[PDB]
Amino acid sequence: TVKVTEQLRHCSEILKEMLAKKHFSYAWPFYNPVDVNALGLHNYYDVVKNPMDLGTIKEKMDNQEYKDAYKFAADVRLMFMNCYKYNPPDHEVVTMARMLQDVFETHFSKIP
């Protein structure tokens, strides 16, 4: 179907919005993969088996790798889920993830 392509172009615009700089203050921890070495996190990969970040999603989107909007949404939500599973809920990163996720969920809910 053609409408799948229209949905994916809406998804690409949503990805560009999540990378926009109105959100920089809370989006920056999600720009790049977690660098466990820079952060001192010897236990991250024990909890998080499938790392995800917006930069990886952008390269996947630039390569036509998402065949429907629902695969894209699953990668974005995976990124958040990794953050929420690894970190305690009172952690700043979780508030920041929720602000970015609110942006995502509001925009994704409009796709037909």
Ligand X SMILES: CCOc1cc(C(=O)N2CCC(N3CCN(C)CC3)CC2)ccc1Nc1ncc2c(n1)N(C1CCCC1)c1ccccc1C(=O)N2C
What residues make contact with ligand X under the rule CB under 6 A? 29, 32, 34, 38-39, 41, 83, 86-87, 92-93
Output the residue with the shortest Cβ distance to ligand X.
Answer: 29
Q: Which is nearer to ligand X, 85 or 110 (CB)?
A: 85
- Report in angstroms how near the CB of residue 44 gets to ligand X at its nearest: 6
Residue with tokens 């919005």, as numbered in its chain: 17
Q: Which is nearer to ligand X, 42 or 110 (CB)?
A: 42
- Report in angstroms how near the CB of residue 19 gets to ligand X at its nearest: 14
Q: Which is nearer to ligand X, 15 or 79 (CB)?
A: 79
- Report in angstroms how near the CB of residue 15 gets to ligand X at its nearest: 17
**Maximum CA extent, the chain:** 46
